Amino acid sequence: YDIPASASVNIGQLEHQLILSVDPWRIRQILIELHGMTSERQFWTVSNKWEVPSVYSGVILGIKDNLTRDLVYILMAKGLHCS
């Protein structure tokens, strides 16, 4: 249900919708909302099924801004999974 008047269940529903989201616009919106409502914590490690090869893993994490690296990591993982 929407508007749970809480924080933990709200973040859980938001990350569940993010996992179930395919359109990159909705993904970006959910990720920026999570980054705005929470602390400077990473949101890319919310699914163990997103296996990114280690050849690009060392460079995908070398970004100062957390929002951009999280977005690019989620996009690359979802694109590889769809391929």
Binding site: S8, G12, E15, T45, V46, S47, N48, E51
Partner: protein
């Protein structure tokens, strides 16, 4: 009791020397003292000797013969009724909990002794939950370790506390919180009868007693879901079916109980979604 203190000090020194150095200098005197105590039939003297031996000669080093002698003396003392003797020994062992009190109190391995130890641990846990002191965490951890070490029969001991946690209305919330903490700290040693107990009467009693608490006490739904997630190794299907029948089919005995069960189910689903598929990526997955 003029020369008794010197004899007790000499016996304690001999026991400490036998525990440190494996010698035969305290094998005959200890046996003679145990025989005299058994022939005199004095539980208070045996309890005092055990307290004096466990006060300072229990955290030095591991004992082999002195520990066996102390266990034999404790068994000879507990052979009789010894109501007040055991009631005082429980408090004496709970006060001197540093640091080998668990290995010295639960070493009797007797039925009545284990029952008294479990009752004392439950009373201490209830007092710690009602007082919420600073050192309450150490006492709760010690009680949980003592309950986990004595895994002979804990179903009746848990049922006796679950039946009392629903009779009153004031201390019922504290008793339920202490029981939940003990179940979470003991890996849920008793979970098969967790759903068959509060069928119609105990469930309504707990729902009516929880209304007298505050928001900080009622916010334990997250802890309850975290405890239920890492539990139910062989009775998960029955508990899940009972929860789904009492939450969705509106088969609850009360009116507000269905909302609480729905919130608990939602919290459990959120915890399962955030812990099973949202834990991490580098380390291996968890075991639920």
């Amino acid at each position: 009791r003029a020369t008794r203190t010197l004899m007790d000090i000499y016996v304690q020194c001999l026991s400490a020397l036998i525990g440190s150095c494996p010698d035969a200098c305290v094998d005959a005197l200890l046996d003679t003292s145990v025989q005299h105590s058994p022939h005199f039939d004095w539980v208070v003297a045996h309890i005092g000797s055990s307290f004096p031996g466990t006060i300072i000669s229990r955290v030095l080093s591991c004992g082999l013969k002195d520990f066996c002698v102390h266990g034999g003396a404790g068994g000879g003392a507990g052979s009789s009724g010894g109501s007040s003797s055991q009631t005082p020994s429980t408090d004496p062992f709970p006060g001197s909990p540093a640091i080998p009190a668990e290995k010295r109190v639960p070493k009797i391995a007797s039925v009545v002794g284990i029952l008294g130890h479990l009752a004392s641990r439950h009373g201490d846990s209830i007092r710690r939950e009602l007082l919420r002191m600073f050192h309450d965490s150490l006492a709760g951890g010690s009680g949980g370790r003592s309950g986990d070490p004595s895994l002979q029969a804990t179903v009746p001991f848990l049922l006796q506390l679950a039946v009392m946690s629903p009779a009153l209305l004031g201390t019922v919330s504290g008793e339920l919180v202490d029981c939940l903490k003990p179940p979470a700290v003991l890996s849920q040693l008793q979970q098969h009868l967790q759903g068959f107990p509060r069928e119609e009467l105990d469930n309504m009693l707990n729902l009516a007693v929880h209304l007298v608490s505050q928001a900080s006490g009622a916010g334990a739904y997250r802890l309850l879901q975290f405890l239920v997630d890492t539990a139910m190794p062989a009775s998960v299907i029955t508990t899940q079916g009972l929860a789904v029948p009492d939450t969705v089919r509106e088969a609850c005995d009360r009116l507000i109980q269905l909302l609480l069960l729905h919130l608990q189910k939602l919290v459990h689903h959120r915890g399962g979604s955030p812990g099973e598929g949202v834990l991490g990526p580098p380390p291996p997955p968890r075991l639920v």
